Design a binder for this molecule. Structure first.
Ligand code: CDL
Ligand code: CDL
Ligand code: HEA
Ligand code: HEA
Ligand code: PEK
Ligand code: PGV
Ligand code: PGV
Ligand code: DMU
Ligand code: DMU
Ligand code: DMU
Ligand code: DMU
Ligand code: CHD
Ligand code: CUA
Ligand code: NA
Ligand code: ZN
Lengths: 258, 72, 56, 227, 44, 91, 75, 40, 513
């Protein structure tokens, strides 16, 4: 080749990923209808196996084999931005469901929002703490980024560790909230919108935290250079996306919808 | 630079978290649970849940989450 | 920790004809066989489950 | 109702169906003309040995290709929107009737004065009286006064249905938890047929609507007899 | 990998009659499937 | 506070080759658009190749949307069949 | 009274809230008049309008819920 | 487009076989089901 | 070697070939389902004796044709084969992720064929509206297997969209601007943008339906304060962009085919064609509620959706007139591909025009949920997509395979198909105007004649499908290997021969400024 692009070795992971999707969906069906978790647990296992080996191979190709030329890195930049945009539109559908329900509350609700019998969480208690936590993690991840560009191993690791710790604190605070909440997913459209929207957000926080932990261990193993660290940038963009989705949830569901 | 973002982390961001943590831990006491009313728009059961006895939500809290028939 | 990237660059650039998903050595082969066996077995099990659910 | 080998709309029973007929004739003329011009221009492009294969300048012709269609759309939209606003225009109904969709039949409620309500089921083919219409007759017709503005309210007690009467220009979805309003005015007595117009499961094809339009005096006698 | 006409496909075109068998099974299985699903639902 | 490797210390494989070639002003991996000569028979556009032919796309005039594609062969300069611009292959 | 007249508060195809509002209005008035032993004939306009517009099954569901103590609107 | 002569020319008789086999592969299975709808 | 090549592919050409095979197979399934629909309607009374099965057949027909036939062939097949070749790129940006977009489709299809085999199927319509699609009116696994089928298909196309946008932005020759890329490449980039934005909204909506069916949510259930009409908004916010997704790549192939067989170096008004496709893609996001003119929305909303919908005719007309202006002055080669493309222009125009009729909410009251709508989309989508596919297939078959078709057979095939689809769908206009509802297993006696003719047309199109398989067999059986094609100077995908080597553009093109 006298181009800069990456011709990827033939790989089984697309097929194992596709089969993991079949096992997870057929597994959910077998859990909801046929009282069994077997297929679902095989599909969750094969999904984690697939993602581990696929992203391992991407590390091998880049850090160890040198395939990420500037042109390849630029492609991955576009790919992550476009992925985040698809994730924004996914959340938009849940925001649309929330505003649809809350702006025109039906007679079954008492014709009011929040519905009759719903006692919202106080948005100035743990929801406000969660907001300070994710905003603070946006500052610390930015400190990590700058440390890395400036060649500062120790301060990159400290900043990234602080960012992960905040992600975990949010997740434990939200788990605790969920358990103390006097309303459930089954408490009509108020519970439906609250738990499905904040639930998908919580999944994204765990995904994002997991990505940051991957970056933390790669940094510990000296994989990042001061100039080449796209996995760190991608995880930072993803992390900022998770913060911004939280801010929209906080204003919409917790504050305006209370 | 890194110096500025570290200054913001320790000088503003973590102090905010410390203060919201204090604010939260001062309002952390258990609220008195409201009288049970079997409202038809709440405690929805169109299909049994796929776990436990089919009638308990996933993060069911006996103290604050009544069943369709009331507090356990 | 010490910087051992050069030694991983040497391993993953060895002229041995292996594809990247197996180039780490025998452990790659075990993890590949576990994955593929679970996927193929799980898929055959999903088909059985379909045959079962297709009748009352 | 439709008749065999029918090409167009059922004859208008209401002033707004009449308006839709005139509006369809206008729009169809434009559809015909544009359809025909494209076919004709295809045949014109394909029937000469003369050639011009060098770069052609597109700027001037694209003015024509955008302005002419924009004018044509305005000429469709003006009458379209006039009729839209007529079918919304405040009227004073003298009567309100509710219909509730069910799997698979309609119920009717006349609750202005008395609590009158009844179910309206398709007559099975095996039970049709000689000369009665397969899939269209019901046991209990919607008795209504002619030459009067009527408010129909449409809802459902189960899945989505849609309450339609093509000869009156009517189609309103029947949505549980929602009360949808339409206006009905028949210029004529007679029987006016329609069919459920939102897929509602296995018997979607078999829950028709039959209006029976009679003079007010007869509508009153029928209401009175129902006590 | 083999290159060239009849070599860039997951099926053989070495023998036109074996090919006809494979094409028949391939498109025929697809076309038959809805008739057999309808049969299946009726036999319930 | 250091301990982060640099591209110069740690880049490898094609990333490193691209990095070293850019330091010398060379473009072996075809990252940059080559700048046209006047394209006359005396001053033909010089098209590098690792082999004896390479596909040329000719944007005959600035802002043409139509690109003209042809194989350029080793040997006598060839001309764009749309604008007549000269191209010469330099293995 | 023939039927419920046009109500500029509810000018659109969705008449759900018109039915709901008149049902609430009638029962709020009936409570106000019964609570002094006053006279429920003052509430007659709201009664005629809700009976005209509201599905029988909605009226019947709401009545059951008022008696059960699960009606979610304020009366 | 220009092409080499057919490496393995398919005669009118070979075409009648391929066509017949192709049509039958569509018609026989569907025909069997539709013919037996009564039995189902 | 067989498993490495066809199961572990990282090759844009092999993956395109897998998508074409997958789509051709899916088209047989979708056609079988269409013939069962028309067999139930071909005489008055009942054929199947089970209207739930009819409803399942109609539902599966639509899902197979849209998700397994059109999008795989257009985007997965022609997209993967042609895009890299038309921009001189060595492969897709994400050649391994590309393989997973492909391998998600067989599992997606399996989930749909499982929906139909368990309980009584999903007899919902392809819209899957609650409450019919809910856990009371459709109890059991069928609707959940349909939701999951759509999730896998959704992920396949979202990842595929990221791949195409990235490849088309990042992997052109450095001198090539976006205004120097072929119209087919534009059509795929714009289709990929519509997919990236619309599929996530569908995924949100069908996830809400999943949770209403299984986790006691009430997004669509009035008892909990929910609204069935919310589902409709989410579904159609995706569903209108989806109909533009289905035709845009077809627009791109048509531009190439008309240009090629007119003997032109270029389509007429290149920048107008890019503008038109971008305009259609943008307007396609602000019109969705024309699928909801009978649900009881406000008059001013109806007025807005009528007006916005009609605007799309302007850019669309620019394309139609631009195709005609490409033919203008051409040395016309009456190849079978040209015939497909001329059929496309005409039939697409007819269906587009019945679209403009339906845009008028007032008339839509009477035409909504009738055979007029079915007529509209079988012209613009069913014939538009299919004619564009068959045109592209007969044009590029020799590039992909290395072998020529028999042109006379291909023309016979075109002729049979043109007669069949018109005999099938044209009479559906009459059925719609005269008031026959769609989604019906049987009809009042007055509708018998046009249903009879429509069903007889469906058999003509079946004869065409069977002949098409014969024609592909004859080309592989005879082995006439391509030597030369004309107009390679303006059709770069041909310049590496037929078929092109496994690896093309290892040495990229030279393009100067
Ligand atoms: C609902 C589910 C969704 C299903 C949808 C399915 C539709 C999608 C199809 C997509 C294609 C799948 C390809 C995957 C790899 C094939 C694996 C395989 O089985 O190999 C045998 C078979 C080839 O057999 P061959 O001729 O002996 O080749 C020998 C090798 O070349 C020489 O190498 P070898 O000797 O090492 O290996 C050959 C050998 C052994 O090779 C191996 O070791 C392979 C082992 C693993 C392969 C598993 C494949 C899994 C695919 C699943 C579906 C996708 O194979 C065999 O002879 C036995 C294997 C038979 C397996 C059957 C697979 C058939 C396809 C699916 C049909 C649908 C059935 C569903 C039933 C529905 C009823 C309700 O491969 C095929 O599947 C080919 C497709 C069939 C022919 C169709 C031709 C039509 C032409 C129309 C042209 C239109 C497109 C134009 C293209 C442009 C030109 C470039
Ligand atoms: C090739 C493959 C075979 C094709 C398949 C076979 C199709 C069946 C043939 C239909 C023959 C109909 C018939 O009995 O005509 C006698 C019929 C006897 O006249 P009539 O009963 O006094 O009808 C006058 C009505 O008042 C007129 O008022 P109306 O309200 O009763 O009429 C409206 C209706 C009736 O429209 C028609 O009269 C027929 C449509 C014209 C066909 C072209 O038509 C529609 O609305 C059709 C919608 C079409 C959408 C756009 C079509 C674009 C056409 C492409 C242009 C190509 C140019 C060449 O003569 C015709 O007008 C021909 C139809
Ligand atoms: C290829 C797929 C495709 C395409 C491109 C279109 C294109 C259009 N469609 Fe259609 N549509 C469908 C597929 C498609 N549609 C499907 C599948 C459904 C049903 C879904 C379901 O319910 O299952 C449907 C349904 C549908 C409805 C809902 C009807 C109802 O259910 O009651 C409406 C309403 O406005 C609509 C309108 C349009 C319009 C205005 C266009 C326009 O984009 C067409 C514009 C083109 C032209 C106008 C012709 C070319 C132009 C000229 C030659 C210029 C001059 C013309 C004029 C001045 C008018 N279509
Ligand atoms: C692309 C979309 C598409 C295609 C191609 C078709 C094709 C056909 N459809 Fe349609 N149809 C829909 C989309 C499509 N349909 C949708 C969305 C609905 C609505 C569902 C609902 O109500 O919920 C529907 C509904 C619908 C109905 C209404 C059902 C009802 O309301 O009760 C009818 C009635 O006749 C019908 C008939 C047909 C027929 C006879 C064919 C065909 O037989 C016409 C001829 C076409 C072919 C035979 C295809 C050939 C192509 C190949 C075989 C691919 C080859 C591949 C390669 C060369 C690579 N379909
Ligand atoms: C701590 C922070 C965040 C934690 C995240 C969640 C933990 C457990 C499950 C993980 C997955 C979550 C994703 C979102 C899905 C739906 C519901 C999740 C929200 C949640 O956890 O809500 C709980 C209910 O969970 C339930 O029903 C059970 C949930 C389990 C079953 C879910 C199955 C549904 C999966 C849907 C898959 C769709 C995938 C979309 C792919 C799209 C591709 C285009 C709330 O508990 P509760 O007792 O009602 O009220 C509290 C009372 N004190
Ligand atoms: C208990 C846990 C349960 C939950 C599990 C669910 C999943 C969790 C997974 C979290 C994601 C981990 C992703 C790790 C990716 C590691 C590979 C990586 O980061 O690869 C980098 C490239 O980035 C790239 O491909 C970028 C690749 C980006 C991957 C994007 C990941 C977001 C994934 C979202 C997953 C789906 C969510 C949808 C839910 C609806 C490699 O290049 P550099 O970094 O420049 O290195 C090279 C230098 O060393 C040279 O000097
Ligand atoms: C109900 C349950 C249904 C859900 C089933 C889930 C479906 C499938 C199972 C998913 C298995 C995932 C396995 C890992 C996939 C990793 C893809 C990846 O990371 O892809 C990268 C490209 O996409 C990029 O960057 C950016 C994009 C990274 C995307 C990561 C994958 C996420 C998949 C789920 C997201 C759906 C979207 C949610 C929005 C609605 C790399 O591309 P490659 O071609 O590989 O390499 C190129 C080389 O140059 C690298 O050195
Ligand atoms: C090398 C690979 C090895 C493959 C081994 C697969 C792992 C699981 C196999 C056992 O299958 C399980 O059997 C349990 C019954 O015997 C099920 O009980 C389930 O059903 C219960 C009903 O009592 C519910 O409480 C729960 O859903 C659950 O416990 C459980 O769901 C199911 O998974
Ligand atoms: C390496 C590749 C992977 C290979 C896959 C391994 C396949 C495992 C087969 C085990 O089958 C299980 O049998 C259980 C016991 O018979 C079922 O119990 C379930 O069904 C029971 C029926 O008695 C109920 O008690 C409960 O729902 C529950 O125990 C359960 O559904 C099912 O999974
Ligand atoms: C809608 C069907 C046909 C529409 C055709 C519109 C074609 C417009 C052609 C414009 O091209 C011009 O023709 C002139 C010679 O006549 C040239 O002198 C001129 O340089 C050239 O640009
Ligand atoms: C939607 C597309 C459908 C198009 C229809 C295709 C045209 C018909 C093709 C032939 O199909 C066959 O027809 C035979 C009858 O001609 C059937 O024999 C059946 O009837 C015979 C005689 O009547 C018996 O001898 C056999 O045992 C018996 O199976 C046979 O099953 C069936 O395969
Ligand atoms: C001593 C060691 C040196 C790492 C190295 O240079 O190889 C240092 C560098 C940065 C350190 C990390 C950062 O200080 C952040 C964390 C601080 C906590 O008190 C311990 C864990 C914690 C995650 C540290 C682990 C360990 O002490 C690290 C990894
Ligand atoms: Cu009721 Cu269709
Ligand atoms: Na029938
Ligand atoms: Zn030139």
């Amino acid at each position: 080749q006298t181009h800069a692009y990456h011709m990827v070795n033939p790989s089984p992971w697309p097929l194992t990923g596709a089969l993991s999707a079949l096992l997870m969906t057929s597994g959910l069906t077998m859990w909801f209808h046929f009282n069994s978790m077997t297929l679902l647990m095989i599909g969750l296992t094969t999904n984690m196996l697939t993602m581990y080996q696929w992203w391992r191979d991407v590390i091998r190709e880049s850090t160890f084999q040198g395939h990420h030329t500037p042109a390849v890195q630029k492609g991955l930049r576009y790919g992550m931005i476009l992925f985040i945009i698809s994730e924004v539109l996914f959340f938009t559908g849940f925001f649309w469901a929330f505003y649809h329900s809350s702006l025109a509350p039906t007679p079954e609700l008492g014709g009011c929002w929040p519905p009759t019998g719903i006692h919202p969480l106080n948005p100035l208690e743990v929801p406000l703490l969660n907001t300070s936590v994710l905003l603070a993690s946006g500052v610390s991840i930015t400190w990590a980024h700058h440390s890395l560009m400036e060649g500062d191993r120790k301060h990159m690791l400290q900043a990234l560790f602080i960012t992960i710790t905040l992600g975990v604190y949010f997740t434990l605070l939200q788990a605790s909230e969920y358990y103390e909440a006097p309303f459930t997913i089954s408490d009509g459209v108020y519970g439906s919108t609250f738990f499905v929207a904040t639930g998908f957000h919580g999944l994204h926080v765990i995904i994002g935290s997991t990505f940051l932990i991957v970056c933390f261990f790669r940094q510990l193993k000296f994989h990042f250079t001061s100039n080449h660290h796209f996995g760190f940038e991608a995880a930072a963009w993803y992390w900022h996306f998770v913060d911004v989705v939280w801010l929209f949830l906080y204003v919409s569901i917790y504050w305006w919808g209370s | 630079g890194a110096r500025t973002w570290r200054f913001l982390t320790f000088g503003l961001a973590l102090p905010s978290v410390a203060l919201c943590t204090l604010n939260s831990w001062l309002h952390s006491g258990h609220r008195e649970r409201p009288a049970f009313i079997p409202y038809h728009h709440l405690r929805i059961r169109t299909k049994p849940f796929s776990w436990g006895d089919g009638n308990h939500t996933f993060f069911h809290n006996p103290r604050v989450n009544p069943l369709p028939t009331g507090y356990e | 920790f010490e910087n051992r990237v050069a030694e991983k660059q040497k391993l993953f650039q060895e002229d041995n004809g292996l594809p990247v998903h197996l180039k780490g050595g025998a452990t790659d082969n075990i993890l590949y066989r576990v994955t593929m066996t679970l996927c193929l077995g799980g898929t055959l099990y999903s088909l059985y489950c379909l045959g079962w659910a297709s009748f009352p | 109702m439709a008749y065999p080998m029918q090409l167009g709309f059922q004859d208008a029973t209401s002033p707004i169906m009449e308006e839709l007929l005139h509006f369809h004739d206008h729009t169809l003329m434009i559809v015909f003309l544009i359809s025909s011009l494209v076919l004709y221009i295809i045949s014109l492009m394909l029937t000469t040995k003369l050639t011009h294969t060098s770069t052609m300048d597109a700027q001037e012709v694209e003015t024509i290709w955008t302005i002419l269609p924009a004018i044509i759309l305005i000429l469709i939209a003006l009458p379209s929107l006039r009729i839209l606003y007529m079918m919304d225009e405040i009227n004073n109904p003298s009567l309100t009737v509710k219909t509730m969709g069910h799997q698979w039949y309609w119920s009717y409620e006349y609750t202005d004065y008395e609590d009158l309500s009844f179910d309206s089921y398709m007559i099975p083919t095996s039970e049709l009286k000689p000369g009665e219409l397969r899939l269209l007759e019901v046991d209990n017709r919607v008795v209504l006064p002619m030459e009067m503005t009527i408010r129909m309210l449409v809802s459902s007690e189960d899945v989505l249905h849609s309450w339609a009467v093509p000869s009156l220009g009517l189609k309103t979805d029947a949505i549980p938890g929602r009360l949808n309003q339409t206006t009905l005015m028949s210029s004529r007595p007679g029987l006016y047929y329609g069919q459920c117009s939102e897929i509602c499961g296995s018997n979607h094809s078999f829950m028709p609507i039959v209006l029976e339009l009679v003079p007010l005096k007869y509508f009153e006698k029928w209401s009175a007899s129902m006590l | 990998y083999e290159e060239g006409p009849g070599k860039n496909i997951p099926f053989s075109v070495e023998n036109k009659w074996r090919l006809l068998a494979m094409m028949t099974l391939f498109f025929g299985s697809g076309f038959a499937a809805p008739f057999f699903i309808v049969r299946h639902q009726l036999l319930k | 506070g250091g301990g982060v490797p640099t591209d110069e210390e740690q880049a490898t494989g094609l990333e490193r080759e691209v990095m070293l070639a850019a330091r010398k002003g060379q473009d072996p991996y075809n990252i940059l658009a080559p700048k046209a000569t006047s394209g006359t028979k005396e001053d033909p556009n010089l098209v590098p190749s690792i082999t004896n032919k390479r596909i040329v796309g000719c944007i005959c005039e600035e802002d043409n949307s139509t690109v003209i594609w042809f194989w350029l062969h080793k040997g006598e300069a060839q001309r764009c069949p749309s604008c007549g611009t000269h191209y010469k292959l330099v293995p | 009274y023939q039927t419920a007249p046009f109500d500029s508060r509810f000018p659109n195809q969705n008449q759900t809230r018109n039915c709901w509002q008149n049902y609430l209005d009638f029962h709020r008035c009936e409570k106000a008049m019964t609570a002094k032993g006053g006279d429920v004939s003052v509430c007659e306009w709201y009664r005629r309008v809700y009976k005209s517009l509201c599905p029988i099954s909605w009226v019947s569901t709401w009545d059951d819920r008022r008696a059960e103590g699960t009606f979610p609107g304020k009366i | 487009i220009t092409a080499k002569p057919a490496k393995t020319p398919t005669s009118p008789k070979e075409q009648a076989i391929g066509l017949s086999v192709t049509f039958l592969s569509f018609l026989l299975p569907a025909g069997w089901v539709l013919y037996h709808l009564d039995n189902y | 070697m067989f498993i490495n090549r066809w199961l572990f592919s990282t090759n844009h050409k092999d993956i395109g070939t897998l998508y074409l095979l997958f789509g051709a197979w899916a088209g047989m399934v979708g056609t079988a389902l269409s013939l069962l629909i028309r067999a139930e309607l071909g005489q008055p009374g009942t054929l199947l004796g089970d209207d739930q099965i009819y409803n399942v057949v109609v539902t599966a027909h639509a899902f197979v044709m849209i998700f397994f036939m059109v999008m795989p062939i257009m985007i997965g097949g022609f997209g993967n084969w042609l895009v890299p070749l038309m921009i001189g790129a060595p492969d897709m940006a994400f050649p391994r992720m590309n393989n997973m977009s492909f391998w998600l489709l067989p599992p997606s299809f399996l989930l749909l064929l499982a929906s139909s085999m368990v309980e009584a199927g999903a007899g919902t319509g392809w819209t899957v509206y609650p409450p019919l699609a809910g856990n009371l009116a459709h109890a059991g696994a069928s609707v959940d297997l349909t939701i999951f089928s759509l999730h896998l298909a959704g992920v396949s196309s979202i990842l595929g969209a990221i791949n195409f946008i990235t490849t088309i932005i990042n992997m052109k020759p450095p001198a090539m601007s976006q205004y120097q890329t072929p119209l087919f490449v534009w059509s795929v980039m714009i289709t990929a943008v519509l997919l990236l934005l619309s599929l996530p909204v569908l995924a949100a909506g069908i996830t809400m339906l999943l949770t209403d069916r299984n986790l006691n949510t009430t997004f669509f259930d009035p008892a909990g304060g929910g609204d069935p009409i919310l589902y409709q908004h989410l579904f159609w916010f995706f569903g209108h962009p989806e109909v533009y997704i289905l035709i845009l790549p077809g627009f791109g192939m048509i531009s190439h085919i008309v240009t090629y067989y007119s003997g032109k170096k270029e389509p007429f008004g290149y920048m107008g064609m890019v503008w038109a496709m971008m305009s259609i893609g943008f307007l396609g996001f602000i019109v969705w509620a024309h699928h909801m003119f009978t649900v009881g929305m406000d008059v001013d909303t109806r007025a807005y959706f009528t007006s916005a919908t009609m605007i799309i005719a302007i850019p669309t007309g620019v394309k139609v007139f631009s195709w005609l202006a490409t033919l203008h002055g051409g040395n016309i080669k009456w190849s079978p591909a040209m015939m497909w493309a001329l059929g496309f222009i005409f039939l697409f125009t007819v269906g587009g025009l019945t679209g403009i009729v339906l845009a008028n909410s007032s008339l839509d009251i009477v035409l909504h949920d009738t055979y007029y709508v079915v007529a509209h989309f079988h012209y613009v989508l069913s014939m538009g997509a299919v004619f564009a596919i068959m045109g592209g297939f007969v044009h590029w078959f020799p590039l992909f395979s290395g072998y020529t078709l028999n042109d006379t057979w291909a023309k016979i095939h075109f002729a049979i198909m043109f007669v069949g689809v018109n005999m099938t769908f044209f009479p559906q206009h009459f059925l719609g105007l005269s008031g026959m509802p769609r989604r019906y297993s049987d009809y009042p006696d007055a509708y018998t004649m046009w249903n009879t003719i429509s069903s007889m047309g469906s058999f003509i199109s079946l004869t065409a499908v069977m002949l098409m398989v014969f024609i592909i067999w004859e080309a592989f059986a005879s082995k006439r290997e391509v030597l030369t094609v004309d107009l390679t100077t303006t059709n770069l995908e041909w310049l590496n021969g037929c078929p092109p080597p496994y690896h093309t553009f290892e040495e990229p093109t030279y393009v100067n400024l």
